[PDB]
Amino acid sequence: STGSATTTPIDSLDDAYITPVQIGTPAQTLNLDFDTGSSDLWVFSSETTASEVDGQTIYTPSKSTTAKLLSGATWSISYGDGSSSSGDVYTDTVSVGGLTVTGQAVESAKKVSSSFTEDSTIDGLLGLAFSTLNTVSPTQQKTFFDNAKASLDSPVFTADLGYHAPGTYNFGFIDTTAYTGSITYTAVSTKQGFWEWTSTGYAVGSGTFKSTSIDGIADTGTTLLYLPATVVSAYWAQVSGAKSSSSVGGYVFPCSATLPSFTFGVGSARIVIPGDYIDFGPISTGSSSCFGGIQSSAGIGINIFGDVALKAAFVVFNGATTPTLGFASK
Ligand SMILES: NCc1ccc(C(F)(F)F)cc1
Ligand SMILES: NCc1ccc(C(F)(F)F)cc1
């Protein structure tokens, strides 16, 4: 079996993407953020403190004839940006784009941090990293992908994110009309639970390609591109008037500048991020300083190929027993 679902940016800056997901019987449709950097499926629900809910669609287990409380199970998660949430655990039927899993763990939020409460368009997260990162205690739970793997035609899913436009998550098959050229595959380390790989280098604009190993994670759940300070400094040095701002918390640049492209290496292939993808617009309304989409990973501890990078490619997440990541131009 296969599944296919359209994914839509939540705002005009592509800050995040939501995908409709059917939970329960009869279906309750929620718009979830598909996150290859985490491994919990959690949702706003009828159990969430009512003051922490501001326009989200909520899952109501009491209206689902297939929902079962997972007795004694709890969950608690903290994200790399300081976000957090926690609650209890149901099992229920979950369908994405025609692909159905029964007995999926649905983590029901009793408490959510303020940054989820303010994002009215995101009803929850659907984690697609490896199940070793799932936070359910005492019995760890499997991801939607891990539960579906058995019945998929091929144990893969693909991410085709759009630039200021809808895109597609496909489960179980590779759409060979959605990319150009060949897919280059590269090895994944699952040792920290992430889709972790090693990029073979970079170039700024039409500069020379610098061969250098950059280890990092493919994370659809992270908006920007976070790279080592030496790389990020070499990129912004080509933008007249760009500077790192401690009050803003990253590199900013004059909104009137044109940004160079950024190339990253996948084995011997090259993925080019157009300069326009790196503009995240004014730091505040009316400002002439704009926020950069490539920032340093020094304060984070790991390099993150987030949406800025992934939306420049067709990306295959191959969850074969030896996992790999595939990249193609599109
Ligand atoms: N998108 C999920 C996520 C968030 C933060 C991190 C960090 F910061 F721990 F690397 C990894 C994955
Ligand atoms: N990387 C996971 C993640 C995804 C979204 C959010 C936000 F934007 F909803 F706060 C926080 C953390």
Coordinates of C-alpha atoms and ligand atoms in Angstrom, one line a residue:
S1 CA 0.0 0.0 0.0
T2 CA 1.0 3.6 -0.4
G3 CA -0.1 7.1 0.8
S4 CA 0.2 10.6 -0.6
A5 CA -0.7 13.9 1.1
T6 CA -0.3 17.6 0.2
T7 CA 1.7 19.7 2.5
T8 CA 1.1 23.5 2.7
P9 CA 3.2 26.3 4.2
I10 CA 1.5 27.9 7.2
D11 CA 2.5 31.5 6.2
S12 CA 4.1 33.6 3.6
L13 CA 7.7 32.9 4.9
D14 CA 7.4 29.0 4.8
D15 CA 8.0 29.0 8.6
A16 CA 6.5 25.5 8.8
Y17 CA 4.4 23.1 6.7
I18 CA 1.1 21.4 7.8
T19 CA -0.4 18.2 6.3
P20 CA -3.9 16.9 7.0
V21 CA -4.1 13.7 9.0
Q22 CA -7.2 11.6 9.9
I23 CA -7.4 10.4 13.5
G24 CA -10.1 8.2 15.0
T25 CA -13.4 6.7 13.8
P26 CA -15.3 8.6 12.5
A27 CA -12.2 10.6 11.2
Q28 CA -11.2 13.8 13.0
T29 CA -8.9 15.7 10.6
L30 CA -6.0 17.6 12.1
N31 CA -3.2 19.5 10.4
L32 CA 0.0 18.2 11.7
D33 CA 3.6 19.3 11.3
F34 CA 5.6 16.4 9.8
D35 CA 8.9 16.4 11.7
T36 CA 11.8 14.1 10.7
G37 CA 13.7 15.4 13.8
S38 CA 11.5 13.9 16.4
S39 CA 9.6 10.7 17.0
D40 CA 6.4 11.5 18.8
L41 CA 2.9 11.9 17.3
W42 CA 1.2 14.4 19.7
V43 CA -1.9 16.5 19.2
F44 CA -3.9 19.2 20.9
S45 CA -6.9 17.5 22.5
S46 CA -10.0 17.7 24.6
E47 CA -7.5 17.2 27.6
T48 CA -5.4 20.2 26.9
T49 CA -5.7 23.0 29.5
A50 CA -8.2 25.3 27.9
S51 CA -6.1 28.5 28.3
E52 CA -3.3 26.9 26.2
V53 CA -5.6 26.4 23.2
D54 CA -6.1 29.4 20.8
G55 CA -7.9 28.2 17.5
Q56 CA -6.3 24.7 17.1
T57 CA -8.5 21.8 16.1
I58 CA -8.5 19.3 19.0
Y59 CA -8.6 15.6 19.0
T60 CA -11.5 14.2 21.2
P61 CA -10.8 10.6 22.1
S62 CA -14.2 10.3 23.6
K63 CA -15.8 10.7 20.2
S64 CA -13.7 8.0 18.6
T65 CA -15.0 4.5 18.7
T66 CA -11.5 3.1 18.1
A67 CA -9.6 5.2 20.7
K68 CA -8.2 3.2 23.7
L69 CA -6.4 4.8 26.7
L70 CA -3.0 3.3 27.0
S71 CA -3.2 2.7 30.8
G72 CA -0.4 4.4 32.8
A73 CA 1.6 5.7 29.8
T74 CA 2.8 9.2 29.7
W75 CA 5.1 11.4 27.5
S76 CA 7.0 14.6 27.9
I77 CA 9.0 16.3 25.2
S78 CA 11.3 19.3 25.0
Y79 CA 12.4 20.7 21.5
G80 CA 15.7 22.2 20.6
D81 CA 14.1 25.7 20.6
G82 CA 12.9 25.4 24.2
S83 CA 9.3 24.3 23.3
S84 CA 7.7 21.5 25.3
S85 CA 4.5 19.6 25.9
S86 CA 3.3 16.5 27.8
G87 CA 0.3 14.4 28.6
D88 CA -1.2 10.9 28.3
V89 CA -1.4 8.4 25.5
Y90 CA -4.2 6.8 23.4
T91 CA -4.0 4.3 20.7
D92 CA -6.3 4.9 17.6
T93 CA -6.5 4.6 13.9
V94 CA -4.4 7.2 12.0
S95 CA -4.5 7.7 8.2
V96 CA -2.3 9.9 6.0
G97 CA -3.2 10.4 2.4
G98 CA -5.1 7.0 2.1
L99 CA -2.5 5.0 4.2
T100 CA -4.0 3.6 7.4
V101 CA -2.3 2.4 10.6
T102 CA -4.4 0.8 13.3
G103 CA -3.2 1.0 16.9
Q104 CA -1.0 4.0 16.5
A105 CA 0.0 5.8 19.7
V106 CA -1.5 9.2 19.8
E107 CA 0.0 11.4 22.5
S108 CA -2.6 13.7 23.9
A109 CA -1.3 17.0 25.2
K110 CA -2.4 18.1 28.6
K111 CA 0.1 21.0 28.7
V112 CA 1.8 22.8 25.7
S113 CA 4.5 25.5 25.8
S114 CA 3.5 29.0 24.7
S115 CA 5.1 28.8 21.3
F116 CA 2.6 26.0 20.3
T117 CA -0.3 28.0 21.7
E118 CA 0.5 31.1 19.6
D119 CA 0.7 28.9 16.3
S120 CA -3.0 28.5 15.7
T121 CA -2.4 26.7 12.4
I122 CA -0.5 23.7 13.8
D123 CA -2.7 21.1 15.6
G124 CA 0.2 18.8 16.5
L125 CA 3.4 17.1 15.3
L126 CA 4.0 13.8 13.5
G127 CA 7.4 12.5 14.2
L128 CA 9.3 10.6 11.5
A129 CA 12.8 10.2 13.1
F130 CA 13.7 6.7 14.5
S131 CA 11.6 5.2 17.2
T132 CA 14.4 5.1 19.6
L133 CA 13.7 8.8 20.3
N134 CA 10.0 8.4 21.3
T135 CA 9.3 9.8 24.7
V136 CA 6.5 7.5 25.9
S137 CA 7.1 5.9 29.3
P138 CA 7.3 3.2 30.6
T139 CA 6.7 1.5 27.2
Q140 CA 8.3 3.3 24.3
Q141 CA 6.0 3.6 21.2
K142 CA 6.7 3.3 17.4
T143 CA 6.3 6.1 14.9
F144 CA 3.7 6.1 12.2
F145 CA 6.4 5.3 9.6
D146 CA 7.6 2.3 11.7
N147 CA 4.0 1.0 12.1
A148 CA 3.3 1.4 8.4
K149 CA 6.6 -0.1 7.1
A150 CA 5.3 -3.6 6.9
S151 CA 2.4 -2.8 4.6
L152 CA 4.2 -0.3 2.4
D153 CA 5.1 -1.2 -1.1
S154 CA 8.7 0.1 -0.4
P155 CA 9.9 1.1 3.1
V156 CA 10.4 4.8 2.0
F157 CA 8.8 8.1 2.3
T158 CA 9.7 11.2 0.3
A159 CA 9.6 14.9 1.1
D160 CA 9.0 17.4 -1.7
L161 CA 8.5 20.7 0.0
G162 CA 7.5 23.8 -2.0
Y163 CA 9.0 27.3 -2.0
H164 CA 6.0 29.5 -1.1
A165 CA 3.8 26.8 -2.5
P166 CA 2.3 23.4 -1.6
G167 CA 4.3 20.2 -1.8
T168 CA 3.9 16.5 -1.2
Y169 CA 4.7 13.8 1.3
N170 CA 4.6 10.3 -0.3
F171 CA 4.7 7.0 1.7
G172 CA 5.7 3.7 0.1
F173 CA 6.8 4.8 -3.4
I174 CA 9.1 7.2 -5.3
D175 CA 7.4 9.4 -7.8
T176 CA 9.8 9.5 -10.7
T177 CA 8.1 12.5 -12.3
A178 CA 8.8 14.8 -9.3
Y179 CA 12.6 15.2 -9.9
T180 CA 15.2 15.6 -12.6
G181 CA 18.3 13.6 -13.1
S182 CA 19.3 10.8 -10.8
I183 CA 18.8 10.4 -7.0
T184 CA 22.2 10.4 -5.1
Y185 CA 22.0 8.2 -2.1
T186 CA 24.2 8.7 1.0
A187 CA 24.7 6.7 4.2
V188 CA 22.7 7.4 7.4
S189 CA 23.9 7.0 11.0
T190 CA 21.0 6.1 13.3
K191 CA 23.2 6.2 16.4
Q192 CA 21.6 9.4 17.8
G193 CA 18.1 8.5 16.5
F194 CA 18.1 11.1 13.7
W195 CA 18.4 10.9 9.9
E196 CA 22.0 11.9 10.2
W197 CA 24.3 12.1 7.2
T198 CA 27.5 13.7 6.1
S199 CA 27.5 16.4 3.4
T200 CA 30.6 16.5 1.3
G201 CA 31.1 20.3 1.1
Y202 CA 29.7 23.7 0.1
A203 CA 30.1 26.7 -2.3
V204 CA 28.9 30.3 -1.9
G205 CA 27.4 31.8 -5.0
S206 CA 29.6 31.0 -8.0
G207 CA 32.6 30.4 -5.8
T208 CA 34.8 27.3 -5.7
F209 CA 33.4 24.3 -4.0
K210 CA 35.1 23.6 -0.7
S211 CA 35.4 19.9 0.0
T212 CA 34.8 19.4 3.7
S213 CA 32.7 16.9 5.8
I214 CA 29.7 18.5 7.5
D215 CA 27.8 16.0 9.6
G216 CA 24.2 17.1 10.2
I217 CA 20.5 15.9 10.3
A218 CA 17.8 16.1 7.7
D219 CA 15.0 17.8 9.7
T220 CA 11.7 18.8 8.1
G221 CA 10.7 20.2 11.5
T222 CA 13.3 23.0 11.5
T223 CA 12.8 26.0 9.4
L224 CA 16.3 27.3 8.8
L225 CA 19.7 25.9 7.8
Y226 CA 22.2 25.7 10.8
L227 CA 25.8 25.1 9.8
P228 CA 29.3 25.5 11.4
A229 CA 30.4 29.1 12.2
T230 CA 33.2 29.0 9.6
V231 CA 30.8 28.1 6.8
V232 CA 28.1 30.6 7.8
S233 CA 30.7 33.4 8.1
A234 CA 32.0 32.6 4.6
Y235 CA 28.4 32.9 3.2
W236 CA 27.4 36.2 4.9
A237 CA 30.8 37.8 4.1
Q238 CA 29.5 37.9 0.5
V239 CA 26.5 40.0 1.4
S240 CA 27.2 43.7 1.7
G241 CA 26.2 45.0 5.1
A242 CA 25.3 41.7 6.7
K243 CA 26.3 41.3 10.3
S244 CA 25.7 39.0 13.2
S245 CA 23.3 40.7 15.7
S246 CA 23.2 39.6 19.3
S247 CA 20.0 41.5 19.9
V248 CA 18.3 39.7 17.1
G249 CA 20.1 36.4 17.7
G250 CA 21.7 35.7 14.3
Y251 CA 22.8 37.2 11.0
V252 CA 20.7 40.0 9.5
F253 CA 21.2 41.8 6.2
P254 CA 19.9 44.9 4.4
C255 CA 16.6 44.0 2.9
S256 CA 17.7 45.7 -0.3
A257 CA 20.6 43.2 -0.9
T258 CA 20.4 40.3 -3.3
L259 CA 21.6 37.1 -1.7
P260 CA 24.0 34.6 -3.3
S261 CA 22.9 31.0 -3.7
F262 CA 24.3 28.3 -1.5
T263 CA 25.4 24.9 -2.7
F264 CA 25.8 21.8 -0.6
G265 CA 27.4 18.5 -1.6
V266 CA 25.7 15.1 -1.5
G267 CA 28.4 12.5 -2.4
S268 CA 29.5 13.8 -5.8
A269 CA 26.3 15.6 -6.6
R270 CA 25.5 19.3 -5.8
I271 CA 22.2 20.7 -4.5
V272 CA 21.9 24.5 -5.1
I273 CA 19.7 26.6 -2.8
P274 CA 18.6 29.7 -4.6
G275 CA 19.5 33.0 -2.8
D276 CA 15.8 33.9 -2.6
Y277 CA 15.2 30.9 -0.3
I278 CA 17.5 32.4 2.3
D279 CA 15.5 35.7 2.7
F280 CA 13.3 35.4 5.8
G281 CA 12.1 39.0 5.5
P282 CA 12.1 42.0 7.9
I283 CA 13.0 41.4 11.5
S284 CA 10.0 43.5 12.5
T285 CA 7.2 45.2 10.5
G286 CA 8.6 48.1 8.6
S287 CA 12.2 47.3 9.3
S288 CA 14.8 47.5 6.6
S289 CA 16.9 44.7 8.2
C290 CA 16.0 41.3 7.1
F291 CA 16.6 37.9 8.8
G292 CA 19.0 35.3 7.2
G293 CA 18.0 31.7 6.5
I294 CA 21.5 30.4 7.1
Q295 CA 22.6 30.6 10.7
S296 CA 25.3 29.2 12.9
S297 CA 24.9 25.9 14.7
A298 CA 27.5 26.8 17.3
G299 CA 25.0 27.3 20.1
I300 CA 23.0 24.2 19.1
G301 CA 25.6 21.5 19.0
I302 CA 24.5 19.8 15.8
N303 CA 24.2 20.9 12.2
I304 CA 20.6 20.9 10.8
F305 CA 19.6 20.8 7.2
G306 CA 16.1 22.2 7.8
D307 CA 13.4 23.3 5.3
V308 CA 15.6 26.0 3.6
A309 CA 17.8 23.2 2.3
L310 CA 15.3 20.4 1.9
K311 CA 12.8 22.4 -0.2
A312 CA 15.6 22.9 -2.8
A313 CA 15.6 19.1 -3.4
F314 CA 13.5 16.0 -3.7
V315 CA 14.4 14.0 -0.6
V316 CA 14.0 10.2 -0.1
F317 CA 14.0 8.8 3.4
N318 CA 14.8 5.1 2.8
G319 CA 14.0 3.2 6.0
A320 CA 15.4 -0.1 4.7
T321 CA 17.3 -2.2 7.2
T322 CA 20.4 -0.2 6.2
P323 CA 18.8 3.3 6.0
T324 CA 19.9 5.9 3.4
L325 CA 18.9 9.4 2.4
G326 CA 18.5 10.3 -1.3
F327 CA 18.7 13.7 -2.8
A328 CA 17.7 14.8 -6.3
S329 CA 17.4 18.2 -8.0
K330 CA 13.9 19.3 -9.0
Ligands
LIG1 N1 12.7 19.1 14.6 C1 12.9 18.3 15.9 C2 14.2 18.7 16.5 C3 14.4 19.9 17.3 C4 15.6 20.2 17.8 C5 16.7 19.4 17.6 C6 18.0 19.7 18.2 F1 18.1 21.0 18.5 F2 18.1 18.9 19.3 F3 19.0 19.3 17.3 C7 16.6 18.3 16.8 C8 15.3 17.9 16.3
LIG2 N1 11.4 21.3 15.5 C1 10.2 20.8 16.1 C2 9.3 22.1 16.3 C3 8.4 22.4 15.3 C4 7.6 23.5 15.4 C5 7.7 24.3 16.5 C6 6.8 25.6 16.6 F1 7.1 26.4 15.6 F2 5.5 25.2 16.4 F3 7.0 26.2 17.8 C7 8.6 24.1 17.5 C8 9.4 22.9 17.4

